Design a binder for this molecule. Sequence first.
Ligand SMILES: [Fe+3]
Ligand SMILES: [Fe+3]
Ligand SMILES: [Fe+3]
Ligand SMILES: [Fe+3]
Lengths: 510, 510, 385, 385, 159
Amino acid sequence: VNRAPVGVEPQEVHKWLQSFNWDFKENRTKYATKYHMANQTKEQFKVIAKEYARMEAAKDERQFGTLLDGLTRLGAGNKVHPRWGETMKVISNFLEVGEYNAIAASAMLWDSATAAEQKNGYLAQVLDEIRHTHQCAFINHYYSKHYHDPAGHNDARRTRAIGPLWKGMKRVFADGFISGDAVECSVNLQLVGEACFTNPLIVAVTEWASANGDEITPTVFLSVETDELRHMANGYQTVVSIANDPAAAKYLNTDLNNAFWTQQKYFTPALGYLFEYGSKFKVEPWVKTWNRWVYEDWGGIWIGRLGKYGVESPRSLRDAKTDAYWAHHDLALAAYALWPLGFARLALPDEEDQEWFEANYPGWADHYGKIYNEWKKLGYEDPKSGFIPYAWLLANGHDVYIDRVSQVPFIPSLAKGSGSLRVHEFNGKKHSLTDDWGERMWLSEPERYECHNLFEQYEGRELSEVIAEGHGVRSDGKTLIAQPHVRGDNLWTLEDIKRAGCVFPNPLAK
Amino acid sequence: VNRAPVGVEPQEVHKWLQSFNWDFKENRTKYATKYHMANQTKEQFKVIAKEYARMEAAKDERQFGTLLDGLTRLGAGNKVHPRWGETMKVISNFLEVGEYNAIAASAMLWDSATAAEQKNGYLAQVLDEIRHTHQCAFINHYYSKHYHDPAGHNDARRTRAIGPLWKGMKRVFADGFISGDAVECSVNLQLVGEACFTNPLIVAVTEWASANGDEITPTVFLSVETDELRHMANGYQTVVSIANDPAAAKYLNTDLNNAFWTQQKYFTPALGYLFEYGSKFKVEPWVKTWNRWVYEDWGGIWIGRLGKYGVESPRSLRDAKTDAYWAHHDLALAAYALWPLGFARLALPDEEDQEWFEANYPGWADHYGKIYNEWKKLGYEDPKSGFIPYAWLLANGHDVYIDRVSQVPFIPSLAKGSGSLRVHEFNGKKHSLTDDWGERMWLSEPERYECHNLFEQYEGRELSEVIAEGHGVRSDGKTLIAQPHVRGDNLWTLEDIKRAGCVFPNPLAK
Amino acid sequence: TKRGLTDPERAAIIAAAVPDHALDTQRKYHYFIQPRWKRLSEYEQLSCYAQPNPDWIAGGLDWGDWTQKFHGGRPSWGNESTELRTTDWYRHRDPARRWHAPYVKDKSEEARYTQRFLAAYSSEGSIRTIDAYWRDEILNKYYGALLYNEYGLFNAHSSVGRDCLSDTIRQSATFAGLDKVDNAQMIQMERLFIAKLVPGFDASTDVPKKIWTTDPIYAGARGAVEEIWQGIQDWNEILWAGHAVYDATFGQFARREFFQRLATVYGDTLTPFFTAQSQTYFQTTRGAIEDLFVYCLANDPEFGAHNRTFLNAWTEHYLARSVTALKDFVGIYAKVEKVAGATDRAGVSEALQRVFGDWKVDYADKIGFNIDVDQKVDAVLAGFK
Amino acid sequence: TKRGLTDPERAAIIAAAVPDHALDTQRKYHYFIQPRWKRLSEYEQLSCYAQPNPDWIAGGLDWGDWTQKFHGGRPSWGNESTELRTTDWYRHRDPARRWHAPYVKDKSEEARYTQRFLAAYSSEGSIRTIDAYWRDEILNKYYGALLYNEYGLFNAHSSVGRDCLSDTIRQSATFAGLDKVDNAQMIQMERLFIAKLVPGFDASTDVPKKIWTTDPIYAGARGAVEEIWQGIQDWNEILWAGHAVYDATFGQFARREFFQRLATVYGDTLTPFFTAQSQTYFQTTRGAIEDLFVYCLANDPEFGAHNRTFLNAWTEHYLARSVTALKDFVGIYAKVEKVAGATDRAGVSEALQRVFGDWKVDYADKIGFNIDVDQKVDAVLAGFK
Amino acid sequence: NSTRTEWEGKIAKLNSVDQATKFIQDFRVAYSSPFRKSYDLDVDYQYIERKIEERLSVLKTEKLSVADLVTKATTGEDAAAVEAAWIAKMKAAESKYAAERIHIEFRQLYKPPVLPVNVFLRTDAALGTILMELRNTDYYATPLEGLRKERGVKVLHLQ
Ligand SMILES: [Fe+3]
Ligand SMILES: [Fe+3]
Ligand SMILES: [Fe+3]
Ligand SMILES: [Fe+3]
């Protein structure tokens, strides 16, 4: 009998994991689906629960120790630009729910997975994205504990519903991944994000946070990217598995185009606003980095890796870039108009910001810079002015309509990007469509989208009353969560909103 | 049979630890001793191996994660003043061996401990100081890996023997704790340091490192202080145990005075040099902080806690402060003279440093500032000058003699502090004594101290040859570990030392 | 390539821009969350309210219908998925305050300690004193069948994850599924290690597969697991059946009594490690699940009995299923060679009585299910020969 | 109250002062240290050469006599403390590369997992199936005697710590002592937990003290431990006697064979956890100690046999002592009630043969000690009735 | 909300299981589906739907036995009969508009607590599979204006 010290390795356990399954008739995917992946499917990463736990625990402590010692010793929580403080506030608030619906959709995948190895990969995905949720929540917690504006992080979950961008983020990550069919959910929840959005989004957030001067986010986001690489590998493997299916060649390209368009339509303007208009120190124009990350280093490699299996690149990218060239600015105008609804505090671009925008974006001045200038000179920041940008927009004939499919705020008269307003009548209810693809999607599947526009939600409701009943007031009970100015002086009060007297008119009802 | 979830606590284990011992005749302390502490002795901290391991592991990972993520992401290793880089180099090099001989002396204590509870406390002390050794070594490792001057940290242990201050640090921490009798070792290794030196030393190092701009050291030093508090408690408890002994009232005060004087005689000038002359940004004069930490918040509390048991405060403090008022400057002159022997790179004080010294230390200018000025104008930094400060000192009639007991460099003509030169002849060998207490100590116990003065060690040996055979050359093989200038240009070469041609003349031999 | 904090002028601009006074007095994260314990726990501080629930979902902060439902009229996260109803879905709090970080820490602990101790055991060569018959037949053949039961429960939790109407509940369910799958991995790894030490041992899963499929001993367990997978869509029903009743009857009896006691009394010492790991995992899962059901659903001030009546029906059906599975499984006791104490009928009946009594006092008394252990244990023992 | 890195002008001054180019090409920490493995290990990178040794100590980088010796002529750290001689004292490297951080991590692992599993076991109430006689008599009376043996070995290492002529050797010795003491704590804590679960159990140490002092069963072990404490000052002799020969004979036989196998075959399941922990600790300590002796002293190119002859003499003397201790201890086998397999004479002889054979092939073959297991096991078994 | 208050208040009069089933049925038909009779009670219809869900559940299990609770619809139809009828209806639905209409009206008629949960989810899965294979096909080919005319929607403003 041998007595040499022998240490077992996870390789054999993973090898037997494939044979762990046993076959019988009644076993089936619980959820509706039209695709069935191959019963056998290899995974790039040989991962067991124990090895995964060790790998995650090492980096998790590492990052918690870093944040709990170095960041609090340097006092870097307070040494951040408040604009970027609000920007990271909204970023963390949105990404936490994004990753939560990510674990939900990955659980759907694991339910609709036949291969045991693929099931283990999906379980690792679920646990990794649970980690991501908790890390985002912990970033919010540390910002609340140390950063000088706690209010936005304290009531992040409760006051999230009031904002208009929240519906769009819900549609892209929350309901964008769980509502589809299981295969489709995979690409939207995984490939569409991991490749075209999450991979780049992270590096950009780290770089911009380093530029502005907050070291709390980078560490967490890099730790997230570590698992996101495994997510990419799992995506590629599961797309390989879903190939060779006769139905795959009939619907996979359509699902890919659907997911890509649905994700980009709101993703592009959202980041564009949160980066260009949410920071004082900008490293590089957002149009160039968006184009690069979404197309040059995504389409080439992924079509190289997938077209061998019969995958066609979406042709919506030619319209997507034309939209993206001004969609972030359009959403910027919409958000600056609807600031009282949102939780984050915002600052109008300054003269250096205006000249930066004009130098990087030709024609930005004559379209947006004056609009911001007359907004500033009409007592935008001043609480005693009692000026509401939405009231000015209504008085000027420019009225905002959100899409029914993507729920993105959209101004038809004040947008230079492509896309047009479409109003539809169906069984006594009017519907607003902003894009041809969205119009087609709503037309084919009216039962798919029933999201209630906030305009009829707040119809007959005064804005200050909506804020008060939505817990949009500060802890003191006299001031709003959001402010027109990044400065910590002359904070707006709910009585100022009452004096303004903005009333929602149902713009779509017209 | 109960089935409620019950979790055991270390309190019962520690309670039975006292009864773990069994009594019989042949059991005795292995080492020589004149004191026997009480067989029963309570400890302030109820510590078991498992609880100690958990407490240490939490903070250990925390600090390693902090150093491995945040410090390397911010690049704070390179963003330090090189003067403070050399200062932390020598601090880490000296404290690692200090804590190593600390674990040795605490092992002696645990060998000479009758109470099981006291034995467990001593074991916890041993493990904590082992942690301290490894943390100091890890600070050196990180400085070597990231800081721009790796040489001093790379060969820290090998080139340590060449320096003259190394003998003094050996006498105070290395041989200061293990050579004595077991009880005496305790107070020198524990009470004399923990109270009069280690408690303050740390806070000062953190504060000064924060001032200069290195965040690597503070975290480790605070983690060390966490255990140092338990060390204090254990010291107080073991002194309580050693009380009520008839022999204690006859020798404890003498041992306390011995330990205090032996520790201070070299401790005060060493830090004084390493703080005032080793940093560009100074927070507070070293004389004031030394006086405060050594007397005001040490003597009051400790005599309050010990004089109830029959402990007399040492009266050497009245001479100690008079020495300390200029001992750091005396050692500063000695170290600037003997820079080629040391490993650390040094920079002469600048005009702002000179005026700071004069403002804080009256009469500093007319004594030391010119001496530094004629040193600077005689090609101190210039390698082509071929100027050796020791050669100038010999030519000017000021010749340095190190003590036989404390092995501290001492200039009689150029020192404003108290103390005088004493030369003694014993069986054909001359001996140099610098203090009355040291003279008495050497006279009573000639066999105690046989340390070989480096002057006869290097007699007949050229300085460049000594450096070359001592591995004092850089990695390239042409330049010295230490430099006359903190600047990274015009580094001195061993051929310049050969051109200088300094030869050790045996100053004591006269 | 320049950091905002390190750069001098950038840091100066940031320090000039930052306001001097804090804008909000309270730094507490999510103060509005009602804490189950005296103080808002950090686990509660993060995990709770992470789920965006519209107002038409119980305890929903958000408003408005789902922005994108399933294809057809069914909502993405409607309350039709569950059959039980509660005043609020966020009331559940794990008794261990176990969010992702402590759970993954403890799981890496299990990995590291298992590897170390396993290497030490290999070095000591203590396997050679094990009973030849025990490790040769019982473990290799039937201990690999419980592997498939654990894997079946694990893949079973695939739906609860997606159809969970809360967030702490989803985290607890995912952690329980991870416990099931890594218990399966522990069984497989123990078999691999035993094969590594003694030559000639069969590490292949073909024999465990044959035992799990074509052997009448585990037919009841296989049927119960297969009915658990796709029989019931309701995630509350899946959690209850696969955690309280079927688990704490069949899997608890198996692991705690047979594969632990018979392992010990047969000179085995490697198996108790893995049995203890599985027992700890089950203890944590059982605590979480019983806290869920008893605190939220079994004692809901409004839904009250409605939620219970349903638990009573599910408990009756799955208790009958688990009793049948145990009666079919008990034949392994006659399969193994006779030993006084555990193996003989009196010890078996006492073990069954202990298992059913603890299960009753843990679940049935709180839920209200009326069970007498005598007829149960007699029905299970009737299959023993 | 201003940090150097955060402050703008201070950081600007620091950036102006720092040189643009690195002064030394190599960043490696202590490159001159000879690595035992292919690459300089991080454990070697820190721990090695931490001891300042003058040139008159083997492998000493420093120069000059000790700056402050003991009172009298004896040096503080002279080589007269040890009887063995080596070319260099820094050649020893722990096979696990175990410096303070991984060791304390693993020890906190043991603490955390032991607490969790212990709480889970308390919740499950598995103790009630244990043998009444076993846990009532054997553990309470005699298992607390091994507590005192472990504590005796632990306090025994008090000298090696101070009289160690190296640094890695000192770290290994301190870690081994910590393993001994926390094994003792594990025994005491297991007794406390058993007292906590079942009422009427005696958690006091008075009965273990009486067993360790006035009972003839452990008289040989007590004598051996007491001779280990103050009998020999030589730290190498202390390490050898208390780790290789006496330990791996007496304590290894006890823990591995009796208190583990007889615990298993008596329905005990709590004890195997603590026995496994102690076995892992002993495995690590034995690996470190055998690496030390075999690599450095037993195969020194110069001192060679000189170092060995001494190891042979120490092995002979302490092997006789341990054989006497085992012969006096074996009476517990007649104390416990008879069970086939382990308890009867044939099984006892086979266990002794296994223990002595593994000890021989692990130490004696490398050292050169000539031992035939037959007479040894016969001498030990002669005391069995 | 007043409307929510009034509706909750009028829910309190539902003391009969069959009457409660009829009330939930016609309320779903009136105010739940995208095909709707009147949008006046929009926005607030989901909360009232949840309240009537809870009240019908409360009336359920009051007299209903376990067998009907597990395998019988509230209206009195067998679960397997519902299975077979709706799968057969979906098989014969060649038109995608007819398929979506029948799927939505089935969801109106038999969804919990009217139908047992497990059988209801199985029906939903089968219907979703059929509708995905039947509707996802050729989405890109048909002209936007073709969808506009086929849906029957009338456009008001376009630019
Ligand atoms: Fe993620
Ligand atoms: Fe991901
Ligand atoms: Fe220390
Ligand atoms: Fe200390």
